[PDB]
């Protein structure tokens, strides 16, 4: 019948702070070799990844780092740590597309070793999502939002300047088949057709990426123009080496990498028909970070609490 003030209840709030960088130059704070991960049984937290502040913070940090460096540079793993009185929640559900509810919540103090890599049309050297293929977007109905494809298995890319850029044909074909079947699962009927970029300049048309020294702008249209009909008939149009003839912008070096993510965009066909045309896009570079930051949110501890009881 009377209130009681408890100092010690496990209550958190969803505020936001200015997290500080950590490293294992502007320099950062220490990165510990252990997690405070503690599973919170019997709780479900309503996550959200499109309303995160960490992405903007890391975009600012990357911009500042590139300004300070300026060629090229060696990226390093960067941890993000929260100040005293705050915690980083983490989602463990494997089919979590990025938003909505979650289970198996675990609390942590500092994130893992994110790599600030900038690439277009192919998320290179990214973290590998397990289980199945992941498709994420902001507003899927709209055709003005880039679709992010998280791949289950890596695909090797090997490119060398004497300029060649080589991929395995069979593995990439299987990966595209998986992407097509997943997208057909997400899009009822409406046989999917893949196309290249339409009319951009020599900078947006091609796949632009960075490795040792120079910038590689690579004509990708030779690895597209496939089709995926309704039932099962994904069929494309030699040798297992597929090569990209492409150009260099500012020898005998090779930079190997993985293709772990796709950045697609849905063409505004307007007319219905029975086809949805997808072309690789770009524009934003905050998506390069959102693939490994879709499970972290920052929570504020509110230790005080009140509760009624028979305390006389």
């Amino acid at each position: 019948l009377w209130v009681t003030v408890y100092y010690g209840v496990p209550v958190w709030k969803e505020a936001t702070t200015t997290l500080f960088c950590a490293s294992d130059t502007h320099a950062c704070v220490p990165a510990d070799p252990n997690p405070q991960e503690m599973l919170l049984k019997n709780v479900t937290e309503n996550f959200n990844m499109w309303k995160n502040e960490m992405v903007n913070q890391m975009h600012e940090d990357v911009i500042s780092l590139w300004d300070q460096s300026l060629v090229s540079f060696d990226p390093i793993p960067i941890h993000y740590c929260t100040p005293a009185g705050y915690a980083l929640l983490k989602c463990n559900n494997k089919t979590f597309n990025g938003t909505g509810p979650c289970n198996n919540v675990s609390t942590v103090q500092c994130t893992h070793g994110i790599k600030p890599v900038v690439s277009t049309q192919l998320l290179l050297n990214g973290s590998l999502a397990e289980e199945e293929i992941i498709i994420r977007s902001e507003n899927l109905t709209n055709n003005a939002k880039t679709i992010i494809v998280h791949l289950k298995e890596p695909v090797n890319i090997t490119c060398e300047r004497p300029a060649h850029c080589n991929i395995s044909r069979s593995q990439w074909n299987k990966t595209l088949q998986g992407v097509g079947e997943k997208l057909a699962e997400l899009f009822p009927n409406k046989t999917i057709v893949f196309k290249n970029s339409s009319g951009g300049d020599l900078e947006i048309t091609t796949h632009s990426f960075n490795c040792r020294g120079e910038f590689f702008y690579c004509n990708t249209t030779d690895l597209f123009n496939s089709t995926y009909w309704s039932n099962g008939t994904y069929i494309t149009q030699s040798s297992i080496n597929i090569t990209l003839p492409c150009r260099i912008k500012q020898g005998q070096i090779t930079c190997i990498s993985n293709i772990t993510g796709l950045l697609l965009l849905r063409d505004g066909g307007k007319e219905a028909n029975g086809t949805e045309i997808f072309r690789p896009g770009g524009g934003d570079m905050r998506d390069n970070w959102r693939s490994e930051l879709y499970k972290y949110k920052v929570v504020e501890i509110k230790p005080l609490g009140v509760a009624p009881t028979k305390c006389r």
Partner: antibody, heavy 124, light 108 residues
Framework: QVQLVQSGAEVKKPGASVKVSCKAS????????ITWVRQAPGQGLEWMGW????????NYAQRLQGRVTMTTDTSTSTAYMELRSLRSDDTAVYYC?????????????????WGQGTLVTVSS | DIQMTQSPSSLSASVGDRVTITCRAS??????LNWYQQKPGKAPKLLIS???SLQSGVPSRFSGSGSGTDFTLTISSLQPDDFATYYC?????????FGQGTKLEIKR
């Protein structure tokens, strides 16, 4: 924080030359480009061109054949724009802005900050 | 060259009303298109980039939509500080042509 400061409004004779300065503050001037755009009394903004503060490359409009010369000073971080052979239709307010990044060039494609603008009036 | 054609030249409405500005292109430009707001006297400022992909601005009052060859800027409620001219600029190809602009009036 980040601001571009222009020169005062000038009046010039026909056939003369006009030189306008643009000072940048609050950021690393060598890490972006600088573009200039004119607005005549009335309606409409016409893109004159842009130049790189790091490489020094310049790209002008096709109508402005050779009447436009554009340079930078890194130590003072100031961009200078020079228009020769003025015509009676050249009276306009000129604004200096930054175009994009130099390296990460496929993401920012907007003119983020703008100067107050310099009014250039030609008359006899 | 790619041309920018803004549907309205001048429109008037009341405070809190929703005004839609339509900007069209002669060629497909994917989703590369920015919007500038020019107050009288002052230089125009960026308000929506690539259909709302900015970093610090974009107050929760403007919105952008559309892709391909037509695009739309939508207001939720007009306010007295909105007297300005809006311009749609392309960023697809080197000719970064602007729109002739639409002057927005608010009725009182």
């Amino acid at each position: 924080q980040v601001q571009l400061v222009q020169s005062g409004a000038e009046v010039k004779k026909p056939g003369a030359s006009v030189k306008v300065s643009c000072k940048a503050s609050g950021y690393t001037f060598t890490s972006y480009d600088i573009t200039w755009v004119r607005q005549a009394p009335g309606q409409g903004l016409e893109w004159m061109g842009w130049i790189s503060a790091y490489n020094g490359d310049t790209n002008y409009a096709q109508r402005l054949q050779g009447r436009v010369t554009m340079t930078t000073d890194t130590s003072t971080s100031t961009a200078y724009m020079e228009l020769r052979s003025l015509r009676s239709d050249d009276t306009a307010v000129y604004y200096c802005a930054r175009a994009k990044h130099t390296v990460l060039v496929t993401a920012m494609r907007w003119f983020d900050p703008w100067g107050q603008g310099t009014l250039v009036t030609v008359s006899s | 060259d790619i041309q920018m054609t803004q549907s309205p030249s001048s429109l008037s409405a009341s405070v809190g009303d929703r005004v839609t500005i339509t900007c069209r292109a002669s060629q497909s430009i994917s989703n590369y298109l920015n919007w500038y707001q020019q107050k009288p006297g002052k230089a125009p400022k960026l308000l929506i980039s690539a259909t709302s992909s900015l970093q610090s601005g974009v107050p929760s009052r403007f919105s952008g939509s559309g892709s391909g060859t037509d695009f739309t800027l939508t207001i939720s409620s007009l306010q007295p500080d909105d007297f300005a001219t809006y311009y749609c600029q392309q960023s697809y190809s080197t000719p970064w042509t602007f729109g002739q602009g639409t002057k927005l009036e608010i009725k009182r």
